[PDB]
Amino acid sequence: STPITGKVTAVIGAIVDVHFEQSELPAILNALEIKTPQGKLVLEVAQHLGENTVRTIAMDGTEGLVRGEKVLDTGGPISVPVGRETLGRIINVIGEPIDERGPIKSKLRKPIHADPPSFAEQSTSAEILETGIKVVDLLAPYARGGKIGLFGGAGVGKTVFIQELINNIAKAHGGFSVFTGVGERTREGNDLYREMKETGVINLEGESKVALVFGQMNEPPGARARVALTGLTIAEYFRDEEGQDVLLFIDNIFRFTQAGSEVSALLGRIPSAVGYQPTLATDMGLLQERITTTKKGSVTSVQAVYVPADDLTDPAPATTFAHLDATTVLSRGISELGIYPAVDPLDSKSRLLDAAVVGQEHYDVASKVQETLQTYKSLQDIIAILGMDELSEQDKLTVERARKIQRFLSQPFAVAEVFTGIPGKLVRLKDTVASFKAVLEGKYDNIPEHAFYMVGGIEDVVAKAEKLAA
């Protein structure tokens, strides 16, 4: 028991002020433990108010706390455990296994306030991730070490998208992945746990090429902020210490924002625009900066983002929009059209989505796709009032191709075996480039529109043409 004993002075929710004794002071971003019959409450020291009275934020619940309650000081920034025995278990924010796969067999521990790498450390990207998902591959190819961002509405198969990505990419990758879920349903969590035990990536008879850190929404806002930080440090251990590249996955980073906004208010900071924390930029920034491709590794974050009321003009999505490198917009409308992908194809953008770097053919094909769709959208207004019939022959051929392309972007998913039941289809990148080129040329304008609808690759499109035919 540290002689750095503090007595609570004010419980005013999460804000818990402690009165450390004369001379004895912790430091900003340190960790205090208060022993309770409810484990050890961790308080992250966030201000000094002087007179040996600090003001700290609570992580665990503050109910029953006695004002004047003895507070031991851990003495340093909250240190989680890291190892390769962190692989394959759900680790809660306070570093305790909540799936009860026994105590984590820690090698090292590290603080969760680890500093982002320097400019010198960063190693310039050029790697191309390919997910075997046609929309992604063609219209916004991903890059290994990227910062993929699933901007979309509320869980608009958002979770489903992450599940597909893990199903394909993670398993394919030999490296670890880190799946961190910040404030997602504990029902959904159990399904994910069961499901990823099922995909065997979590193998409880073996090791796991993924770790989980599930922090769910029923945890005080303060804890919600540092679920992300906790997960991040494990990824750094993988990137650095194990050297292995990974693919980080975080969910949902609006929860990271929302949580931070809330405790800013409690911390007394004057709320910024749409009540967001003034420290929003730097909090996002620290998170993003920490995640990078270095000369020690590569980390490919896929961060879910919930865009409130599908408004990207909302400052919290807009700030994240800058901070990420490989944006994706998941539109409700496209979901409703029955297309899964639900992606808005014109609004997909990625750091890697170049010309020569994606291949001259790929670029040209994609330029043609974009124009065709953009035209189709433009003509939608003309069709709306004037009618379909007042369009030209060239336009009609473009409309016919666009509708076919629209339904050729549809690619079944394994995670829509719980939806449709229809087994997923994943088409390799080279194959997609070739197949789309043909369509645009009108080599498959002799194929019905519905024979593209909810079927994969060209072979499938042709096969479904035969199927519909007889």
Binding site: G183, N218, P220, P221, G275
Partner: protein, 85 residues
């Protein structure tokens, strides 16, 4: 609700409307003179509701299938879905 869950009973809880809870917490917080939260609702409403809502579940087979179901109700006071609550 937990009594139903504990018994393994299947039950359903309608929480109509959470919006009036928020007003109560607003009143409460501001007359505990805690700084006004977003849209005059203290910023810890999310914690309040989230903890509440996750206490309705289809529990494990160990827990005898305590299937409490929740239906929260928010009455849109303008159709403004971007409102904080």
């Amino acid at each position: 609700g937990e009594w139903f869950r504990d018994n393994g009973k299947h039950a359903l809880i309608v929480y109509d409307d959470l919006s009036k809870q928020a007003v109560a917490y607003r009143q409460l917080s501001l007359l505990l003179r805690r700084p006004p939260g977003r849209e005059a609702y203290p910023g810890d409403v999310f914690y309040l509701h989230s903890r509440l809502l996750e206490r309705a579940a289809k529990l494990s087979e160990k827990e005898g299938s305590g299937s409490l179901t929740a239906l929260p109700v928010i009455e849109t006071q303008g159709g403004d879905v971007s409102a904080y609550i």
